[PDB]
Swiss-Prot record, chains A, B:
Sites bearing N-acetylalanine, chain numbering: A1
Residue ranges of the TM segments: none
Residues bearing PTM Phosphoserine: S103, S105
Lipidation positions, renumbered (S-palmitoyl cysteine): C6
Gene: SOD1
Species: Bos taurus (Bovine)
Quaternary structure (record): Homodimer; non-disulfide-linked. Heterodimer with SOD1. The heterodimer CCS:SOD1 interacts with SLC31A1; this heterotrimer is Cu(1+)-mediated and its maintenance is regulated through SOD1 activation.
Catalysed reaction equations from the record: 2 superoxide + 2 H(+) = H2O2 + O2
Modified residues (N6-acetyllysine): K120, S134
Listed name of the protein: Superoxide dismutase [Cu-Zn]
Pfam family of the protein (one): Sod_Cu
Length: 151, 151
């Protein structure tokens, strides 16, 4: 309802803890992700909270308005399109995002859905091939977790 | 949501997959859990979907109506009180429960909360002692997972 949390795990070294808090009429996303390669990594909400086949069973990006993939500042984007997180030379990425389209309740609620951090940078729907318009060319899912209600 | 799933994991060998499906004004819970010691094991929905400290961070039983702990057929029970699952000699528990109090939507929604399989049998609030009234004397949490939206 007001606060949520996600613990990111995968088959590699990438781990992290993401916190979500409804503040006013928006949602603030914070936390950190370690064990990444330096550089940008796509960071999205995928539709299902199903981890029966690791991160693969989370499905595509959460997209209740049926739009094409984009960057978080675009009109045309998926609700789950949170852009990229940037890791330092030590593999650490600090997440500090304010997003208008996600919610913690109602139609846009991401509770019970999956947060994924990807292998490569998300090209924000501007790569030029069909895959850019679905995933940003963000590639494999390095770690993920189901978003749960927190105290 | 009309369907949900949860993958149970812990620090030991207990693991499992639980499916949830709304049917009528009930939730049908099916699945299997392996790696258990033969006999009954308490099986409850805990309040928070927070795995930051393993299963310990899931909090107490989901109890929105502030009742004492009971068995699933009791009027005085927590919403998250699903009774016991039973493992056979090979440590395999088959899950098949129909419950009318838990839900996949609205106020009693368990999406984003934690399913827990316990060390001991749940005494269903009839243990004679005080601990019975809170947890059923089910003991340790062997495995847990956050309940997620499924396809
Ligand atoms: Cu993605
Ligand atoms: Cu997208
Ligand atoms: Cu319990
Ligand atoms: Cu209880």
């Amino acid at each position: 309802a007001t606060k949520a949390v996600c613990v990111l795990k995968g088959d590699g070294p990438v781990q992290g803890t993401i916190h979500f808090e409804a503040k006013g009429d928006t949602v603030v996303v914070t936390g950190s992700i370690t064990g990444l390669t330096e550089g940008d990594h796509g960071f999205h909400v995928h539709q299902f909270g199903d981890n029966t086949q690791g991160c693969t069973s989370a499905g595509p990006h959460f997209n209740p308005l049926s739009k094409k993939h984009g960057g978080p500042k675009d009109d045309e984007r998926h609700v789950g399109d949170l852009g990229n997180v940037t890791a330092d030379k030590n593999g650490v990425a600090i997440v500090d995002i304010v997003d208008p389209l996600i919610s913690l309740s109602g139609e846009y609620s991401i509770i019970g859905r999956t947060m994924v951090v990807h292998e490569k940078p998300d090209d924000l729907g501007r790569g030029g091939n069909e895959e850019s318009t679905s995933t940003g060319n963000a590639g494999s899912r390095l770690a993920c977790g189901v978003i749960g209600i927190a105290k």
